[PDB]
Amino acid sequence: TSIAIGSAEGFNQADKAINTAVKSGRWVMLKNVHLAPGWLMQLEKKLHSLQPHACFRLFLTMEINPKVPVNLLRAGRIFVFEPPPGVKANMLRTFSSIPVSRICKSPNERARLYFLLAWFHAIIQERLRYAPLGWSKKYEFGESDLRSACDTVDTWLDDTAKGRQNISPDKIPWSALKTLMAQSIYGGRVDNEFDQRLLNTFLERLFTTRSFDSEFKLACKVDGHKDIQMPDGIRREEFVQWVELLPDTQTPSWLGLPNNAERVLLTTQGVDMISKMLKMQ
Amino acid sequence: DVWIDVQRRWVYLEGIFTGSADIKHLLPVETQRFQSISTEFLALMKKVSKSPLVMDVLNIQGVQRSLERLADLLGKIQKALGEYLERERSSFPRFYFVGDEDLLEIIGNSKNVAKLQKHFKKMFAGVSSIILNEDNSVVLGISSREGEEVMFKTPVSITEHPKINEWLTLVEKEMRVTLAKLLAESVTEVEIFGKATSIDPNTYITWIDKYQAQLVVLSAQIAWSENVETALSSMGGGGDAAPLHSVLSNVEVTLNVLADSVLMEQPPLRRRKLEHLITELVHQRDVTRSLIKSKIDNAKSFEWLSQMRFYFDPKQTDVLQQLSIQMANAKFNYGFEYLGVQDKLVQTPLTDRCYLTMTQALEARLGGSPFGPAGTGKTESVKALGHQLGRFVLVFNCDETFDFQAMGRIFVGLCQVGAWGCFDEFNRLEERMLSAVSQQVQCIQEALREHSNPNYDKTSAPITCELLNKQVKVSPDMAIFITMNPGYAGRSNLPDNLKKLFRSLAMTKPDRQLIAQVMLYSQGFRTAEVLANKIVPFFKLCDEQLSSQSHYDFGLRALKSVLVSAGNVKRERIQKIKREKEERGEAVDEGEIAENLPEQEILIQSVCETMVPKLVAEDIPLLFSLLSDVFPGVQYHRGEMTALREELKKVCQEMYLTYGDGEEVGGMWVEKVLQLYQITQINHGLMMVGPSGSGKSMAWRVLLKALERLEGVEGVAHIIDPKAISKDHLYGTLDPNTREWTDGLFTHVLRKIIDSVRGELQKRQWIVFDGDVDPEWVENLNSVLDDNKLLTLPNGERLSLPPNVRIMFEVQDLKYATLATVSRCGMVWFSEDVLSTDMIFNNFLARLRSIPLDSPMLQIQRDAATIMQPYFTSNGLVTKALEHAFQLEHIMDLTRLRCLGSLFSMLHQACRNVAQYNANHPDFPMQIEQLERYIQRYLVYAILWSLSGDSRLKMRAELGEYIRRITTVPLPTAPNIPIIDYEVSISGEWSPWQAKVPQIEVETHKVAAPDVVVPTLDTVRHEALLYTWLAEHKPLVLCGPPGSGKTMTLFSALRALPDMEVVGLNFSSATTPELLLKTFDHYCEYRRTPNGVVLAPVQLGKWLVLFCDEINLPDMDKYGTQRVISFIRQMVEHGGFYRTSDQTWVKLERIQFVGACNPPTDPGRKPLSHRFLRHVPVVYVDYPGPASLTQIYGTFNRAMLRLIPSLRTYAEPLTAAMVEFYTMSQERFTQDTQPHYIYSPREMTRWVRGIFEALRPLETLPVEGLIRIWAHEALRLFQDRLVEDEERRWTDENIDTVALKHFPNIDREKAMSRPILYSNWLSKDYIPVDQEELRDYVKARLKVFYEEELDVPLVLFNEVLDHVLRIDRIFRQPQGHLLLIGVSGAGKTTLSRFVAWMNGLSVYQIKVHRKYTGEDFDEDLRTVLRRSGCKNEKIAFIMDESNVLDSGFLERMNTLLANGEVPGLFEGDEYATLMTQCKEGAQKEGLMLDSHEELYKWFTSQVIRNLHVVFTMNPSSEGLKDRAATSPALFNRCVLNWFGDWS
Amino acid sequence: KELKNIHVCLGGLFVPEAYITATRQYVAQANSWSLEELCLEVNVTTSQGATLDACSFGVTGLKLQGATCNNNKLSLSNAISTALPLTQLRWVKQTNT
């Protein structure tokens, strides 16, 4: 039972659902509980004097703000959800979130399309860290955009491929996918001409028939003279296995940005780390 | 608790069942039940009314049981009626868009269809009325607001379907099927018009006239889509000759025909159809050109699927599903909702991108979220897409009152009807409301997703969603759209879960050039391309080059307004050329007229009419240079609107205003008036921006009167101060319990205009918002000030703005308004240079010569005006004096009209003085020479007191010296005495003020009494000035340091006016107009005179002076507005306010306001609004100087020391010792260190009073004892509030130093034994007490205290003895309140209780708990006030800072501390009970009082004499500063004792 | 006339877009051209070694991020920013080519 916090009827529904689930063993999720900091305290006291069913679970989704009571934080286990640390982690999360049966479907090219989608999503989400240069503002390129892009890819591939096991890369509706991602899915958030130009950059560079060649490069001159190579596989597990063997030497050149873009940031955080190590002394 | 509920239920149910005489035919069984209920009700009315006694009816048996049965019956019948309303809403779901009372109105009025014709506008998109035959028995068709009608193929017969829901559903279905059939026929014809080399204009115009505006555009789109699809299917072979060029040429020739058509005169409906067709075919031409350039040869290429394509299948049996609209992979079926004649937008690249994104969102069964700055056309694009699919789109202007329940019911209506909800400003909701609404949105979207599954079949169970604990059917055609402006003020943050439910789209840069080009081309402008390419860069360069002003807007709305005005101007110029040709010759050729038409000149005229009025002076040359550069060689000269100009002349003459043409005096004002008229003609939302007193109000009033006298249409203006009332009182409230809507002020006015019972729609209605503008209240008018012209309320009601209504704002700035409001309003900028000072002088002189002040009075006024005319000219005495005074320093911001109004009031007082002289001397009236001398000297005097009255002495002297240098009036000849020290005698000669200051001898028993003033120069000057300002009833403000004597001066001046009764109000940080309303309820009454409701004081013949103690304390909101200050400004400038009980204008009579305040630079004080300060002269009362203080307290000391003759020679030194030390401390301890370190003559007054009390009983006393008393009082005054030890050491040392300096030959030890203790416990008199004897006495009294009262043992040290002595000192004084500041657990409460027990006071402490509220505090306050004011019981009310749970606690306590009464505490039966007990108490005392006013005065006096409030709080740094503003009386009415921590 | 030959720092002006508009207006008025048909061309030269014609205005303080300018041609660089010595903004008639 999912309940959104904020209204009196919401509090009544939350109380009723928790009271039912602590006996039945069902699950209760409460969303945006940070908007009612006072009620969270009575919720914590109610939870403390309670011996619910074995399978009962209570999830409280919230934003990271100081209004959340400290006692509630101590009473429960905290999980922080944020952008993945790097391109490899982002692509691994993307592949884990999408079901295996979805990627492995009638056309074998769907797996490579999904891999391209994951790489694209990882690149644009990782460029958000270098906010002045990677983009012009902190766009909210998130998981909903990834779902919309996956749905678009599925719909247009199914339309083009009437259940055929294999289709030619030139027959893939590249223009439809590129336009829908540059105008509706990812371009909807973009409110700048130059950010739109950069999105069109990435979409034209990545989504093309040339992405199905063995000589395709995902990125160029990442460090020195080597470059990221497009995997030659045709199955989802092979793409995931390629993602697992990423060098773990990510640089902003992976994103197309200059390598020095992180030099200030990686400096500040480093100094920041010292400060934290000094604050806990 | 049962009778009232049953009574109300029966009343409203009887009203429902009687107003609807046909409701019985559909509700039979409950009709019989209600007949039985009515018979029972008649039985009760026939039984209880015979005996009008409660005891006579509570003795009758069978009453309570029958009442309970009736209550149950009423509840059951109400529930049944609610279920019936729900069931009837289930069929024909459009009834979800009407209220329950409205639904019942249609239910009961099914027989007569005339009453139902006003409900179709809110149940249908474009159906305004239903066409019926003469019998009113069959529905022949439908009609729109524009008059376009659709004739049903098969009319709906009401006789064959008597039930309302059935024939309404049949009407809707017949609407859809008739629209489908007409669309099919129009498509059949336009196909013939298609695939043709040439098009006959006559046949095309005939086809356009035949079909509706919706259907012609739809058919053109269908034909073009079919042609393109056929061409692509032919070209699918690849590398083949393209017949797509044939489609492009067909579009081109049709565009040529349409462009030729719009050049010539057309009927308005045909012209709008031609414009829509031109726009659509221009878009088609652009799309075809893009397809040709891209070499698209496949119909399955995305360059063709990304477009909106229309497929028509005549083979479909269902005409509703006959048309399909497809964009990318999204498919929709045309809703066939009659939309009337809407304004089509230009399909720009952004619009296309918006269409694609929103259609993708719709296919995903999730909402759309277009975001961006205001004026990007986010809302219009959503409405245009909805109209493209034939959907019913409702726009809801959302605010924070759109709570969970309102949004839920809106969603229920949208689900049932199957309509599109465009929620504009969705971020104006609360974040918690956004989160709550996210759940409903998710449920609806999940239901839609389940509907879209192919496994579902329409024959199975319908899809329902859980909305508001109910199963609600969800139509597949529902859509939710939310347009929000990210970054604006008053906007909230959307939760992530809600954001994931919408597909967002950035609409930031509209394609302005394309819009301009297409709009100008559709209006008939030849060379529209060059016009657009000139006018869009012009707007961009105006945005870049011009200075940044808060009222500047050069976005799309501005260009849109410019383009619409350009089209209107072109039509008017064509008509003018036509009539000129008719009167000169007979040859008329419309093609020639179009050919030789200066289109660029028309565009320049439009730009000047729309952009120029808002420009500031420094930006006008820049914009005109931009015009000369972008449009070179073309010039526009504004037409001379003479016919309005003579009307303006006549109105100005009748209103004593100055009129000018061009460069004469007042010409700029008339130019601004004409600009305002043009903006009214072009805009339905206007705003008049400019500094206070720039002539805005007179401008729009004169324009209204001139328009009434020119057009013959009577003009009615409703003036509202939006920030003088709460937003709930402005727009309305929705009851969270009963879902009942109470209209606000603006809502009530608009609804009354719309109903037009008294012919309101036939009058020019102007709703002016004269007040501050912030996004909290003005954004609710967004949909009002937009194309929607609609006010949307949370209860789902939508009110359309009538065409005769203009929404106007009169503001002084827009620094807090967002761009959303600025862009939706035409701005007229009123600089201070528009209204010259000569204009104000002319107005004043004309009013003086015309309006009598009380005809001999008018003759005196005319003579005085003739005498003072030479000084009121340009570069005259007054003008130069004002210019110089603007260079001085004043206690408040100096505005021209404040000084000018002060001067005018003083001149009116001078005329009244001359009239009084003439009345006093009937034999010898004042002659012309004496009058001339008096008027000139008084003019100089009034200039001095009006232009420097709010300044210090040195500024006043500087202004006097400047006037002396520049004036020619005979002035006082003293080499060193400033002119400000003289007054003007009625004989016409300067006389020094010192002659009015006599050395008085105050009576011995009246030493330092509250109403005893020692005459001083400032006292006699300020008294005269206040008398002058009060006699005219002009509101005034006294500014100065606390304890400067503002209240004393005001009361002294009012003593000379016996016809005025003063009422004290003490403002604080949380003061709101409800305090004023309570004061009005207590002291005044409302009566309904034939002219309206008038609020006047109860005491006839008396003027009520509402004296506000701290007028600048009330808190400003985050937009720099004090609500109470705006309320007072409205009551002063408009002479009344609005009663929010019934939204009625109440006019004040015999009520005037006086304010007092500390300087605005003081902590906790805010500067007053310039629009408020314009009407209130400000007088600066400074602290008395050493000479004046020496005189005032020297007099009090002599009167005091007259008690002991042997000490009579020590009055002069003692006063000096009083004056010096008080000075030193005032320099040593300032508000910079601690907030409470405030020293004023008030401390010295207490000093003299305390020494006088000490000296009253003594028959004799040596000098050493007098010095000891002086030092003890100095310690109790200057040392008790000190925080640090070093400050108290300084106080001791300098007390000794001052005493030794002023009393050399004394015994130091006998007078300054450091334990200086005084008490009247050991003896009858207040003689000094020894520390050891005092300790023993306190020990014995503490033993008795333990035995009788609280038994907590106490340890006695010296500080305890000092503190109990101080508390005993305070409890022995009238209105003696304490503020003990110290650490918790230090014994403050215990010592206070012990001292109260010793003095016989009854200790009262409020018992605060978790459920303690304001009502409990009010009840406790009533209890204490009754006990201490009616029973004559001395009560020590002990309150701790932790007992406070709200600011209302501090408000009530502040009022009680300052005045001794709360004006609104006793209201209702409580007031009657209080009056009864007060009469009983007065009879007990021996006073026979009859009226409630004098009895309430006696009650207040008893409370003041008895109640002692002891406030205890911990010593917080910021807490004390906060309390100094929240409760000022805690620091001016309470004695502060700093106990601190134990030393 | 002297105000045309001075080199200003666009970052040191309260409203630099007003400066761009003013230069465009000056060029349009000098040549009696229409204001809307003027486009901007950029020429990067040394501050001392430069000449301003009737349409050229000098600008200093512009910084090129991630690129270097040689002979008025841009090349990618690994430096954070490169200081452009002097920038000549020259207003010309639009060619639509």
Ligand SMILES: Nc1ncnc2c1ncn2[C@@H]1O[C@H](COP(=O)(O)OP(=O)(O)OP(=O)(O)O)[C@@H](O)[C@H]1O
């Ligand atoms: N045409 C005129 N000729 C002479 N006096 C005028 C004229 N118009 C206005 N005045 C006077 O000048 C003052 C202007 O006051 P008005 O209320 O019109 O200004 P405002 O800008 O609307 O003020 P506020 O901002 O305080 O609401 C008044 O004293 C008014 O009587």
Ligand SMILES: Nc1ncnc2c1ncn2[C@@H]1O[C@H](COP(=O)(O)OP(=O)(O)O)[C@@H](O)[C@H]1O
């Ligand atoms: N494509 C267009 N063609 C014509 N007028 C347009 C177009 N887009 C927007 N407009 C106009 O611009 C204004 C936008 O109003 P609105 O939709 O309320 O803006 P926003 O949603 O940005 O607040 C209206 O005057 C509207 O008619």
Ligand SMILES: Nc1ncnc2c1ncn2[C@@H]1O[C@H](COP(=O)(O)OP(=O)(O)O)[C@@H](O)[C@H]1O
């Ligand atoms: N001429 C005077 N005669 C008597 N008292 C005076 C005179 N001038 C000043 N005072 C004293 O100044 C103080 C002013 O108190 P109050 O009227 O409350 O000041 P404010 O209105 O500035 O708060 C009183 O103690 C009053 O007795």
Ligand SMILES: Nc1ncnc2c1ncn2[C@@H]1O[C@H](COP(=O)(O)OP(=O)(O)O)[C@@H](O)[C@H]1O
């Ligand atoms: N002088 C004192 N000697 C002994 N106990 C004291 C003394 N003053 C206060 N107490 C004790 O402190 C408590 C009362 O504190 P109270 O007067 O309520 O504190 P506060 O100063 O915060 O009002 C009781 O326990 C009382 O016996």
Ligand SMILES: [Mg+2]
């Ligand atoms: Mg006004």
